Design a protein around this ligand. Structure first.
Ligand SMILES: CCCN(CCc1cccs1)[C@H]1CCc2c(O)cccc2C1
Lengths: 338, 273, 57, 232, 222
């Protein structure tokens, strides 16, 4: 039995990379060499967003492009009005060990979790005027590495137990588990339609999942080291990943392979976080060495640097209207850039 | 000799204590309570080099002759006792900070917490207020310099009180405090039963060594010019020992910052840029 | 045994990935390029908006 | 959520009463609190404000210095000590919640009120109407105007619309000119130019009977319209 | 400032009242000793947690001579340690548990597994500055076993007696020789048993020495 199944697995691995290689008629570079460069991206820190007292681990924008949640190891989930720098809420976490946070597409909820193995869902819009824990999504057996809401009742969460899970929040219940990663899953990105998501893991692999059918559609494997960061390109047909390889990589869904890589010889450090600009033309990546690099996503030219942090950039988010990027850091600050 | 050496000292003190102010202004790893005292020391040494020492240059260039109003002499003399007593009392406040680090270690445990910041806002205020309180009598009837053609401090009724409160008191307290730090560190090792516990003994020795070597021969020579009868004391010894006093401000960046790693990192960045 | 069940599950998954209607990378690369060209004017990070309409003055 | 209110009944002119308002079922310390007066058969008048954590206090000039707003967060209780009462103070006083952050709904909850019977350059809000006799099912379009533009430099227009039903305390319908409150049906909608404003009741119902007040929140003192009643 | 509406001013006031509570909770969090509790599965962690108190992180709180201690037992986590161990970079001390009795027990040898774990934690880039408290947790059962079975089951390289003193001291040195970075790190080893107060006193002693040495770095003496 097992030797024949292993031969058939290796034979399918030959057939699938042969099918990818048959698609590879020209590389993205050959198609974008004739396009004009971005020029220098010279963003300025327009806001510094100060009240966290430990490392920022995560942030997420609201869909309004004005509120952002952020989470730090001081056990606070802070909601910021980015325009005024006002703290809208500071939410005391039951476990300080938060590694991720998400803000619902409605702005009604924030989610967070980490080394507690729980994704806590916080209702922002109570009649009581405090923020309350509405649900605790217990059922992962390793740390919560990522959360993303699909809507007020559906959240996809990623874990150190090597699984993603989709939850029904009102039942408190993982309605789907996604199991095919062999390493700890570190990151999620929902597709723009929320029918798909990608997750990147410590087996240096990214998997595309169908949310509704509960299955891995595609696996992507060009990274030499563990994927910390993942983001859909804004069309939903491709995604970027960032890893401890000190590379980002852009992968097609439709052609099922790597298009391009984003690295410079003087970049030697793990990519913590990844985001696209609204047109997808800029790929923003956050690093240890304490900065964010902006890439021409079409050329892989390093288009600019967001050099304002004193410790590891742990987070990025571009706003949904594309106006700004917020970058979060282990130095305990969030900086907003334009 | 001395005139151009004071010009070299003004540049050395402005460079050295300017680096201390700039490194804490840039580097948030240096923006501790603990280093706000080392900036308070650097401000005292900057105001010595920028306000006080050019008058020391010009007074030594004229051969001890004052060409200006006695209002201006009181300003120079009060700024000298002010900014030098602020340098000396900052050495003493830094010793009491370093004693809190050892004997009240839980309170100190992160050099940025609000109760630690309150404590150095208090002792920095005490440094600068007590420097004013000992210098301000020289704005009025205690600056009894014998002829308007000279500007110096020379009367027993002030020079003893001034040398005591500005130096022999905070010197005695600083020696007592650092000796007690060395004793408590030896007691920590004895109670536990290393190279960096030997570094603390080296830093206590360098701190008391420089504070003795610069300021003690001045405050001896200053009291002996005024209060001694039949001493072999001279303007040469007083000019040599006042120069050696102002040399403390040149050594203070060396002593309080170049022996710390966060300061050396910040200085190598500033020296690179 | 669990390892044989996983080897069957892994074969079924690698088969379900192998049978995918992949497009040529040239077409897929040109479709990202076309999305960037279409939305380039709509991107405040790619083309900075004037300080009058930037929310972050 | 409640605001239950006591101190009231008869008092002589020149006299004094402590109004109190005990909050329950909400995070009282995080809310700013207002008192709003309503003189018998007259409109709403804002009296006093105390912010969350007491750091800000405001009064109407009709009560400034003469009334004091006080607050006991550990007891979940709000107070109005009225030190020199006059006939012009006879009213139902409503304790009112407000909370201020981006996208919040201030004035969202009002207590049942307490009645005080004293024995015997502000922004002007105008509704250019007093009563409207009308029938269910049809649309209604109430309107208001301000002496100053309520459209601020930040793009908010600071109208609030309140409905007060007969024998009941006011209810927030619309906050910040466009936005309808929690538990208010989509039948109510708000619009305006920055100086003129409309509340549309798109399909009227028997529960919509009552006095409708606009209020500005651009500047203190807060000022209400005179109120327009809908009746069957 | 005239540029802010009445509601903007009340939102800035709320934001500043949130800052006041964040800063106060930071003051509370700064006076708390963060302890990371490590060691292999049966290493005596539970005996330590009982004495100190008397899946996911078990965070346990204790107070001793007005230090407040938070103990993070990361033992129930089963996941890639280098993805989350950097959460603990701000820890005061690691407490590392070793079952001293496990020199002759199987995982392939448990004492060598404890040493490989200790080496990887000790010499970690996130903990270069961070001291370690070793608890060698079962000195009674080690005295019962050492009389019966030699240390040569773990260390064929050893050449001392199967007396408690020489065997226990050799194991302590077999862990403390795993320190690289001896310039910046210290190990505080303590032989441990069924014992209520002395082990908690040892954490307080070793943590006070660690805080003093952190303060002496913060003022340049160390
Ligand atoms: C190195 C400082 C020298 N100065 C010396 C005054 C000068 C005379 C001629 C040229 S400069 C002292 C004067 C006495 C005094 C004091 O009683 C108390 C605290 C400070 C000082 C400052």
């Amino acid at each position: 039995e097992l030797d024949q199944l292993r031969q058939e697995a290796e034979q399918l691995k030959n057939q699938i990379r042969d099918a990818r290689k048959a698609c590879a008629d020209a590389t993205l570079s050959q198609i974008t060499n004739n396009i004009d460069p971005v020029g220098r991206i010279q963003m300025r820190t327009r806001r510094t967003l100060r009240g966290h007292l430990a490392k920022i681990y995560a942030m997420h924008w609201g869909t309004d492009s004005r509120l952002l949640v952020s989470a730090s190891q001081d056990g606070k989930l802070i909601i910021w009005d980015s325009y005024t720098t006002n703290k809208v809420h500071a939410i005391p976490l039951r476990s300080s060990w938060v590694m991720t946070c998400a803000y619902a597409p409605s702005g009604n909820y924030v989610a967070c979790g980490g080394l507690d193995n729980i994704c806590s869902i916080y209702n922002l819009k109570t009649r009581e005027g405090n923020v309350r824990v509405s649900r605790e999504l217990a059922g992962h057996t390793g740390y919560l590495s990522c959360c993303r809401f699909l809507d007020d009742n559906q959240i996809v969460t990623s874990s150190g137990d090597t699984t993603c899970a989709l939850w029904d929040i009102e039942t408190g219940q993982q309605t789907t588990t996604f199991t095919g990663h062999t390493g700890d899953v570190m990151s999620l990105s929902l597709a723009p339609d929320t029918r798909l998501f990608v997750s990147g893991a410590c087996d240096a692999s990214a998997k595309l999942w169908d949310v509704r059918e509960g299955m891995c559609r595609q696996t992507f494997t060009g990274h030499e080291s563990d994927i910390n960061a993942i983001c859909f390109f804004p069309n939903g047909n491709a995604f970027a990943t960032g890893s401890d390889d000190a590379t980002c990589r852009l992968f097609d869904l439709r052609a099922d392979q790597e298009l391009m890589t984003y690295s410079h010889d003087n970049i030697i450090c793990g990519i913590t976080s990844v985001s696209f600009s609204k047109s997808g033309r800029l790929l923003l990546a956050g690093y240890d060495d304490f900065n964010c690099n902006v890439w021409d996503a079409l050329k892989a030219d390093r288009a600019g640097v967001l050099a304002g942090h004193d410790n590891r950039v742990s987070c990025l988010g571009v706003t949904d209207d594309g106006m700004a990027v917020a970058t979060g850091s282990w130095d305990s600050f969030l900086k907003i850039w334009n | 000799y001395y005139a151009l050496s004071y010009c070299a000292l003004i540049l050395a003190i402005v460079f050295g204590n300017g680096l201390v102010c700039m490194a804490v202004l840039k580097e948030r790893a240096l923006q501790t309570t603990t280093n706000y005292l080392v900036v308070s020391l650097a401000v005292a040494d900057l105001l010595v080099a920028t306000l006080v020492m050019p008058w020391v240059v010009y007074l030594e260039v004229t051969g001890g002759v004052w060409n200006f109003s006695r209002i201006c002499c009181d300003v120079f003399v009060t700024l000298d006792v002010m900014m030098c007593t602020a340098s000396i009392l900052n050495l003493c406040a830094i010793s009491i900070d370093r004693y809190t680090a050892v004997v009240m270690p839980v309170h100190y445990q992160h050099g940025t917490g609000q109760s630690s910041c309150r404590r150095v806002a208090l002792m920095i205020t005490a440094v600068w207020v007590l420097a004013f309180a000992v210098s301000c009598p020289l704005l009025f009837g205690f600056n009894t310099t014998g002829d308007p053609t000279v500007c110096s401090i020379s009367n027993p009724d002030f020079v003893i009180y001034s040398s005591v409160v500005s130096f022999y008191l905070p010197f005695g307290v600083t020696v007592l405090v650092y000796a007690r730090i060395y004793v408590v560190l030896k007691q920590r090792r004895r109670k536990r039963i290393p190279l960096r516990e030997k570094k603390a003994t080296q830093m206590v020795a360098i701190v008391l060594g420089a504070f003795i070597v610069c300021w003690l021969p001045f405050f001896l020579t200053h009291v002996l010019n005024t209060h001694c009868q039949t001493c072999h004391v001279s303007p040469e010894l007083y000019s040599a020992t006042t120069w050696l006093g102002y040399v403390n401000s040149a050594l203070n960046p060396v002593i309080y910052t170049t022996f710390n790693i966060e300061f050396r990192k910040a200085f190598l960045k500033i020296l690179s840029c | 045994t669990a390892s044989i069940a996983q080897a069957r599950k892994l074969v079924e998954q690698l088969k379900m990935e192998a049978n995918i209607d992949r497009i040529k990378v040239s077409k897929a690369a040109a479709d990202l390029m076309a999305y960037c060209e279409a939305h380039a004017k709509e991107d405040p990070l790619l083309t900075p908006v004037p300080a009058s309409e930037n929310p972050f003055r | 959520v409640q605001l239950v209110e006591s101190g009231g009944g008869l008092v002589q002119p020149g006299g004094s009463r402590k109004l109190s308002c005990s909050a329950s079922g909400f995070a009282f310390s995080s809310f700013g609190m207002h008192w709003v007066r309503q003189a018998p058969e007259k409109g709403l008048e804002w009296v006093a404000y105390i912010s969350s954590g007491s750091g800000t206090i405001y009064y109407a000039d009709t009560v400034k210095g003469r009334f004091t707003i006080s607050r006991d967060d550990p007891k979940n209780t709000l107070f109005l000590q009225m030190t020199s009462l006059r006939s012009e103070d006879t009213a139902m006083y409503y304790c009112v919640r407000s909370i201020y952050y981006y996208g919040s709904s201030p004035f969202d909850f009002w207590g049942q009120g307490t009645t005080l019977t004293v024995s015997s350059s502000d922004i002007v809000m105008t509704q250019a109407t007093s009563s409207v006799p009308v029938t269910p099912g049809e649309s209604v379009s109430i309107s208001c105007r301000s002496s100053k533009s309520l459209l601020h430099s930040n793009g908010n227009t600071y109208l609030y619309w309140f409905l007060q039903r007969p024998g009941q305390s006011p209810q927030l319908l619309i906050y910040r000119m466009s936005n309808l409150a929690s538990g208010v049906p989509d039948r109510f909608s708000g619009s305006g130019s920055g100086t003129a404003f409309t509340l549309t009741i798109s399909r009227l119902e028997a529960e919509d009977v009552g006095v409708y007040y606009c209020m500005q929140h651009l500047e203190y003192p807060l000022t209400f319209g005179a109120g327009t009643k809908l009746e069957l | 400032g005239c540029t802010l509406s009445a509601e903007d001013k009340a939102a800035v006031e709320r934001s500043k009242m949130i800052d006041r509570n964040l800063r106060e909770d930071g003051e509370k969090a700064a006076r708390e000793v963060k302890l990371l509790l490590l060691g292999a599965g049966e290493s005596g962690k539970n005996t330590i947690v009982k004495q100190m108190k008397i899946t996911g992180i078990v965070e346990t709180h204790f107070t001793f001579k007005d230090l407040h201690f938070k103990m993070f037992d990361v033992g129930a986590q089963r996941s890639e340690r280098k993805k989350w161990i950097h959460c603990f970079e701000g820890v005061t001390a690691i407490i590392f548990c070793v079952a001293l009795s496990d020199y002759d027990l199987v995982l392939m040898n448990r004492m060598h597994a404890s040493m490989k774990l200790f080496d990887s934690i000790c010499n970690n880039k996130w903990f270069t500055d961070t001291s370690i408290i070793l608890f060698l947790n079962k000195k009674d059962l080690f005295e019962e076993k050492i009389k019966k079975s030699p240390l040569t089951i773990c260390y064929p390289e050893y050449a001392g007696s199967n007396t408690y003193e020489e065997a226990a001291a050799y194991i302590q040195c077999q862990f403390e020789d795993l320190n690289k970075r001896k310039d910046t790190k210290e190990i505080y080893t303590h032989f441990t048993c069924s014992t209520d107060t002395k082990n908690v006193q040892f954490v307080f002693d070793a943590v006070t020495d660690v805080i003093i040495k952190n303060n002496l770095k913060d003022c340049g003496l160390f």
